[PDB]
Symmetry: D3
Subunit: 157 residues, 6 copies
């Protein structure tokens, strides 16, 4: 098969986020239309190897912030597809921004929602930016060579 | 004497959001470089007048959603400036998306934060999309004819 | 009192096209939110004054074509609003292209259809690019300072 | 060889359209730089499997129209190359729009004209959006890995 | 009576550059379609007032560079028109970049060349990005409300 | 490995330019993440085979200039990556423009500087457009499948 690369848009700040993250990453490893090795994973592309957790003084460093912001934008713009791991109860402003950038860069925008949450209401603008929204259990078999437009089968506020 | 129009980006989903919203609107009324009458306020431009809070039957109507999403994008693209009323503790995914769209449409992107919150950490991607970020009490006097790039005097996460 | 400029998108290749053209121009003269004098009219901006109808020697001149094409794109990109005078039975490929360019340049895209034709089916892609579609008799009073998204009250094919 | 995907921009509303469609599709099947399987063919991507011919009531459904319009845009934006099967005597507004969108998305824009019609006049804006225009008989051997800019060897009005 | 704002694109690194700069600024002061007061002049918008010529300690500060680069992009994107003061014998890479950004932001791109140099060859890519190119002595009277595409009356290389 | 294509942005007007050109081309031949055959090399894509050196009358031909400019833009837009061979002492306005276009087209923008010059000051706008800047000796081993954002380790004016 041909393979496409993605940007792994996913929060890592809550238990539900980290669960969905692990699940989505596992689904991508099993999906044969995805080149995960050459995809952009934010958490493995930390500027200069420095760990924002082990040294939180870097959250006042404007150079760190500039480089990290730009790395993410670059990760979106140089890969085929924008993936948003999306928790309806824990909606993320950063992801929202990235979705808007992905749209502007002409990328397919795919949201993935945990099966337990699929159907719960999501922000209108999330509903609208997305080209499609699927459940976590569909991610391993999603054909990224033939991405199509569809509507969320769920609520929007 | 020259005046600019804005898109009023703001959540309306919490008490702090609604407080900041009311404050920002009052600041705009007093700002002599702003034409507020010809500006786009999402809450007054929802398809058919309906708000999914006041009429929850439209929470699954895809026509309402399509038209409302598109009207907001149109409100961003046809106005001079993008405004984001921004609560650091209650960040909004919808606004995040709109910030990214505004960037893509070449708009000055100004965040306004309540004075009581100015300085609190904001999402890196919000920090990065923004051209500038000011406090609520600066909004009435901000010169929208000479908008400049500046860094938030505050943290990111 | 604020005024917007437009690009006058319209075919001039049939009797119905020319009729609608004349009507739309008269409506614009009477509309107080339009600065028609500073607007771009393709037919008056062809390279060197020449019209391939009035001087068919320029039908193979690539310089004339380059300059005229570029001037039209420039006329779209430097004006506030994109207008498409639109005959459902005599749709125009050139205008279609210009609608797509206008979309890409972040312009409000307004179709105007002769009252006698308003409601007739229009191409899906015209329906979709457009932000709104109105009847000729609405054009003189349309408020270009507060342009909104609306759906055609009519069919597509 | 490396292979590129396309969007199959072609009308299906006249005898000449359907002839050129069949020919262009055959040429693509034989072209070794094209991955036709993973290309976007509108007519095989009808929303929800519903047949606009067998159920023409869906031409008043705004959801059907929204999804179909968006699928086409998505088909253009997620594929490498924009292909416009172009009949000079039957110029298509929908294709025109799609050409403008393709330009905006940074795609190579290739028009293909039946050999019997190559040379006949085409709209200036079609001439201008295109990066190249070739005859149907050149399509099977076109090297899509090395697409180049050239001018139509033909008239433009 | 309507006025446009500009971005003052110009090198300041040679005697001819500085001469042309002074001349162009004087022309703009006298041009009644230009609002010079609300226009963006890079040299007066450098981060913190500092010029790497007057304070060379900032020649390795990445914060100064980030903010100054971003302010210039912002100055281009929030003003109506892109101006390039252009010396054919002393072409400037920085201005070149800014011309390309201006193009991407849908701005009219006007080059102005000292009368003594008008006609000398200019880089092809400068020739191509530009919408028009005029002589210094035309700048005071140029009608920025009706900007049109025209070709340089001069050579390229 | 997956391979990416590039646009070979490099002047050919000085001894230092031609040296860096030869070196960069050699590095690309040895880099296994690059498909050089299907990359766009300006100097081998001269319009219609005509040699601007052997026939310098074509530098007044507007058709030659139109086609050549458009070929370059096309070469940037249809390839994966923008490469700028960059001489700090011989900065090129044409390259600058192309860098701005590449940014606008969503491309990774890589500057390459001869090792003997790496560290010398470069224009701010060059520093800013670039996603990364490396030395000639790093080009053969650069992983174009995982391009990342970084800052020039050098001066900027
Ligand atoms: N029902 C909704 C939800 C969101 N928004 C837009 C406007 C606000 O700025 C932001 C709120 O999340 O997104 C909207 O217009 N209507
Ligand atoms: N000779 C031509 C052909 C087309 N057009 C542009 C302007 C019209 O809106 C549309 C007409 O097809 O395209 C033009 O300016 N000149
Ligand atoms: N230190 C610098 C270098 C360049 N520029 C911008 C503004 C000029 O138009 C162009 C000069 O090279 O680029 C700038 O603002 N500051
Ligand atoms: Br830390 C960090 C790294 C990358 N993206 C982010 N978005 C918000 N915080 C972020
Ligand atoms: Br039905 C239909 C489907 C897809 N594209 C179209 N353009 C005009 N009608 C269309
Ligand atoms: Br000749 C020539 C060919 C291609 N690009 C160029 N840029 C400046 N001169 C050029
Ligand atoms: C960008 C990376 C991640 O997807 C989000 C977190 O807020 O921002
Ligand atoms: C988009 C699909 C097809 O190419 C045209 C028909 O008008 O619109
Ligand atoms: C575009 C091709 C080359 O890279 C430069 C020369 O000025 O312009």
């Amino acid at each position: 098969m041909p393979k496409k690369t993605i940007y792994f848009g996913a929060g890592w700040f809550t238990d539900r986020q980290n669960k969905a993250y692990k699940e989505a990453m596992e689904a991508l490893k099993e999906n044969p239309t995805i080149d995960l090795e050459n995809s952009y994973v934010p958490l493995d592309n930390q500027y200069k190897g420095i760990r924002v957790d082990e040294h939180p003084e870097y959250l006042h460093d404007k150079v760190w912030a500039t480089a990290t912001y730009n790395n993410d934008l670059n990760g979106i713009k140089t890969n085929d597809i924008m993936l948003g791991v999306y928790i309806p109860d824990e909606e993320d402003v950063g992801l929202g921004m990235e979705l808007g950038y992905a749209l502007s860069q002409g990328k397919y925008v795919l949201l993935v929602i945990p099966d337990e949450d699929y159907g719960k209401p999501i922000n209108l603008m999330s509903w609208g930016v997305s080209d499609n929204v699927i459940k976590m259990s569909q991610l391993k078999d999603f054909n990224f060579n033939k991405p199509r437009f569809d509507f969320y089968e769920g609520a929007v506020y």
